[PDB]
Amino acid sequence: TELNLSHILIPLPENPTSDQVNEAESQARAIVDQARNGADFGKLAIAHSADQQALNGGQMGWGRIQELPGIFAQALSTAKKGDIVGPIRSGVGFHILKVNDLR
Amino acid sequence: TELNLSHILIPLPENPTSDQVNEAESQARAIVDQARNGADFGKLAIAHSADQQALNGGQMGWGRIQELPGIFAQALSTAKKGDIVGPIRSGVGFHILKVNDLR
Amino acid sequence: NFTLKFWDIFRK
């Protein structure tokens, strides 16, 4: 399976305090809600993502499910086109993914 | 379960000829062999790796097994400190991993 | 953390 994904990263420092974690999670959940309710995901990435693909709407292009970080592949086990998944926690922060296409 | 890893990518274009594949696999195998023989893995990465961490000796730092791409997770789950794993083929080339530590 | 450092390797 392959997925065409867009991604948003809400960053966290290396050893975050519980307050820092909670604040990042809050922002990420708000973004997930805005996206599910129809907000342009690319614009959300441009405005909030800390990753290198932020300016290009967080577009990650086509990827093989077996090459995605395990925590992302697991969260996308039943995803369908248009779905917003997350927030997903990793050592770098909270991640939000949008399924643009699948094949 | 956390691992500290270093990585080397011997690249392949998206639709490689069989000769391109054979040549890349040969170089990746030679690197695995030298690394297992005690060669400085960071120097091997600086010299041959095509990824963004090459100039930093292929150092990837720490992470959880579930944060790894699926194609590396199974193999690394049973590795021990010091092991050189690979070559593992992906859509972008052949990969060589060194387990710097487990914690 | 290596989560995105690894993912970046596969991006095309």
Q: Which of A50, A97, C9 is nearest to B58 (CA)?
A: C9
Partner residues linked to B10 by β-bridges: B94
Q: Which of residues 67-96 of A touch C (CB under 8 A)?
A: 67-69, 71-72, 90-92
Note whether A81 and A16 are within 8 A (CB).
Answer: no
Whether residue C4 and residue A9 make contact (CB cut-off 8 A), yes or no, is: yes
Whether residue B67 and residue C6 make contact (CB cut-off 8 A), yes or no, is: yes
Whether residue A62 and residue C12 make contact (CB cut-off 8 A), yes or no, is: yes
Number of neighbouring beta carbons within 10 Å of residue A38? 7
Q: Give the SS3 label for residue A95.
A: strand
Task: Tell me which H or E stretch contains A89.
Answer: strand A84-90
Q: Which two tokens stand for residue C12?
A: 């095309």
User: How far apart are the C-alpha atoms of A58 and A70, rounded to whole Å?
Assistant: 19
Q: Is A44 exposed, middle or buried (0-12, 13-18, 19+ CB in 10 A)?
A: buried
Q: Which two tokens stand for residue A95?
A: 């991640």
Amino acid of residue B73:
A
Q: Which residues touch A65 (CB under 8 Å, ≥6 apart)?
A: A1, A2, A3, A73, A76, B70
Q: Which of B36, B71, B81 is nearest to A68 (CA)?
A: B71
Q: Are strands A93-102 and B84-90 parallel, antiparallel or unpaired?
A: unpaired
Task: Tell me which H or E stretch contains A10.
Answer: strand A2-11
- Residue identified by tokens 């290596």 is C2
- Residue identified by tokens 């077996």 is A66
Q: Which two tokens stand for residue B81?
A: 């400190």
What is the DSSP annotation of A23-36?
Answer: HHHHHHHHHHHHHH
- Residue identified by tokens 């809050």 is A26
> How far C7 CA sits from the closest chain A CA (Å)?
6
Closest by Cβ to B69, choosing from C1, C6, C12? C6
Closest by Cβ to C6, choosing from A60, A64, A69? A69
Q: Are strands A2-11 and A93-102 parallel, antiparallel or unpaired?
A: antiparallel
Q: Which two tokens stand for residue A96?
A: 């939000």
SS3 content of chain B, % helix, strand, coil (to 5): 40, 35, 25
Determined by X-ray
Q: Where are the beta strands (DSSP E) in chain B?
A: 2-11, 59-64, 84-90, 93-102
Whether residue B69 and residue A67 make contact (CB cut-off 8 A), yes or no, is: yes
The CATH class given to the B1-103 domain equals: alpha beta
- For chain A, domain boundaries: 1-103
Resolution (A): 1.3
Whether chain B has a CB inside 8 Å of the CB on C4: the answer is no
Closest by Cβ to A91, choosing from C1, C11, C12? C1
Note whether A66 and B70 are within 8 A (CB).
Answer: yes
Q: Which two tokens stand for residue B21?
A: 């594949």
CA atoms within 13 A on the CB side of A24: 25
Q: Which two tokens stand for residue B19?
A: 């000769």
Q: Give the SS3 label for residue B61.
A: strand
Chain-centre distance for alpha carbon B62: 15
Q: What angle do CA A57, A61, A64 make, to 5 degrees?
A: 145
User: Exposed e or buried b for every residue in B30-65, given b needs 16+ CB within 10 A?
Assistant: ebbeebeeeeebbebbeebbebebbeebbbbbbbbe
Number of neighbouring beta carbons within 10 Å of residue C7? 22
Task: Tell me which H or E stretch contains A60.
Answer: strand A59-64
